[PDB]
Amino acid sequence: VLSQFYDREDWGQALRLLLLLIEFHYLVLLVAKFLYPIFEDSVATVIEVIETKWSNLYETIIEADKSATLLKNLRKKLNFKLCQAFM
Amino acid sequence: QVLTQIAGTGATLRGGAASDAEEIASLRRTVKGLKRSVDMLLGGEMARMSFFR
């Protein structure tokens, strides 16, 4: 969070978050939300692992954030892949 | 643009038009094809070269 408040730093923070998610549903959703808000090879690998890893409380959290989820996540992943390809 | 300029000048030369009309039209096509390829690479297809299609 401190790093977030403070580009490379942001990437390091995102990586840390992905690592935490791997170690651990709600957390995963929060992570996806953060990634969408932000929207190379290591990053792609992480995104992939997350997709591989991918109830009511989670849905509620998702609804609060929006104020379907899986689809949005897939879309974000596709966008990231496109970005990596362009790079 | 250089080719468009050369072809035009070639069409109004004293003594008769230039013989290289189609030779230049071919070069135009090749140049456009290369600008297309380069534009695709620059536009993202270069960062996605190691990916399966």
Give B-chain residues touching A81 at CB under 8 angstroms: 48, 51
**What 3-state class would DSSP assign to A54?**
coil
Give, in order, the Cα–Cα distances in Å from B51 to each of A38, A87, B36: 23, 12, 20
Give B-chain residues touching A43 at CB under 8 angstroms: none
Rounded Cα distance between B53 and B42, Å, is: 18
Structure tokens given for A66:
């929006």
Rounded Cα distance between A84 and B44, Å, is: 8
**What 3-state class would DSSP assign to A67?**
coil
Structure tokens given for B4:
């468009």
| Burial state string for A12-25 with b = 16 or more CB within 10 A and e = fewer than 16 | ebbeebbeebeeee
Give B-chain residues touching A83 at CB under 8 angstroms: 47
Please report the DSSP string for B1-53 in residue order: -HHHHHHHHHHT-TTS--TTHHHHHHHHHHHHHHHHHHHHIIIIITTTSSS--
Work out the burial of residue B12: count CB atoms within 10 Å of its CB; fewer than 13 is exposed, 13-18 middle, 19 or more buried. Answer: exposed
Rounded Cα distance between B18 and B45, Å, is: 40
Of A4, A47, A9, nearest to A28 (Cα)?
Answer: A47
Mutation for A interface: B48, B51, B52, B53, most A CBs within 10 A: B48
Residues 66-85 of chain A with CB under 8 A from chain B are 81-85
Asked whether A84 and B47 are in contact (CB, 8 A), the reply is yes
Structure tokens given for B13:
């030369």
Rounded Cα distance between A83 and B1, Å, is: 33
Contact A82 B51 (CB under 8 A): no
**Radius of gyration for chain B, computed over Cα atoms and rounded to the nearest angstrom:** 17
Contact A86 B46 (CB under 8 A): yes
Give the method of determination. Answer: cryo-EM
**What 3-state class would DSSP assign to A66?**
helix
